[PDB]
Amino acid sequence: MTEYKLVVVGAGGVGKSALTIQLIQNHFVDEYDPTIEDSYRKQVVIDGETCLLDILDTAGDQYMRTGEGFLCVFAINNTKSFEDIHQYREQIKRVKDSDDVPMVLVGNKCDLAARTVESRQAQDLARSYGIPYIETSAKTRQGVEDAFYTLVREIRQH
Ligand SMILES: Nc1nc2c(ncn2[C@@H]2O[C@H](COP(=O)(O)OP(=O)(O)NP(=O)(O)O)[C@@H](O)[C@H]2O)c(=O)[nH]1
Ligand SMILES: [Ca+2]
Ligand SMILES: [Mg+2]
Ligand SMILES: [Mg+2]
């Protein structure tokens, strides 16, 4: 079957681990245990295709080198995390030595009310990169499968 190597990156505390764990294990991690480097693997059917997903959960270059697609995550209630997305874009360019890498911009914690990053603002950034913008909530599961599955579909268009 086809294996897809996905990598989740972004500032500390934006919800990278919670997103990955919600997708793979179907539960919300409420506590905040900073990640060093973890990996998850699971078989799922996407668009009729049985897929093996290998997901690298990073801390907010070597281990990311094999990544085929990246989720660049920021939190909608953390303006600085949005402003620093370029740092992760730069790292991905360095590790893959390419300006054409499958990616999805993710605005997480959309269930929270203290929003400082408006959807339109993120849409404009995603448009400049030529990638989709999807909002998610690791807490309610909103958009979680959509974000990861869309990344797979982006890798397919590659
Ligand atoms: N309300 C809400 N809280 C969230 C959401 N995603 C994550 N959190 C909370 O935010 C905190 C940090 O989440 P975590 O997944 O550990 O973030 P991280 O990006 O993986 N951190 P690190 O880079 O240090 O590894 C946790 O207390 C977690 O419950 C979300 O969608 N909604
Ligand atoms: Ca703990
Ligand atoms: Mg983490
Ligand atoms: Mg503003």
UniProtKB/Swiss-Prot annotation:
Changing D38N: No effect on interaction with PLCE1. The keyword Signal does not apply. Gene3D superfamilies: P-loop containing nucleotide triphosphate hydrolases. GO terms for cellular component: ciliary basal body; cytoplasm; cytosol; endoplasmic reticulum membrane; glutamatergic synapse; Golgi apparatus; Golgi membrane; GTPase complex. Keywords: Acetylation, Cell membrane, Cytoplasm, Disease variant, Glycoprotein, Golgi apparatus, GTP-binding, Hydrolase, Isopeptide bond, Lipoprotein, Membrane, Methylation, Nucleotide-binding, Nucleus, Palmitate, Prenylation, Proto-oncogene, S-nitrosylation, Ubl conjugation. It catalyses: GTP + H2O = GDP + phosphate + H(+). A motif (Effector region) lies at residues 32-40. Changing V29A: No effect on interaction with PLCE1. Involved in the activation of Ras protein signal transduction. Ras proteins bind GDP/GTP and possess intrinsic GTPase activity. This is GTPase HRas. It comes from Homo sapiens. The lineage of its organism: Eukaryota, Metazoa, Chordata, Craniata, Vertebrata. The gene is HRAS.
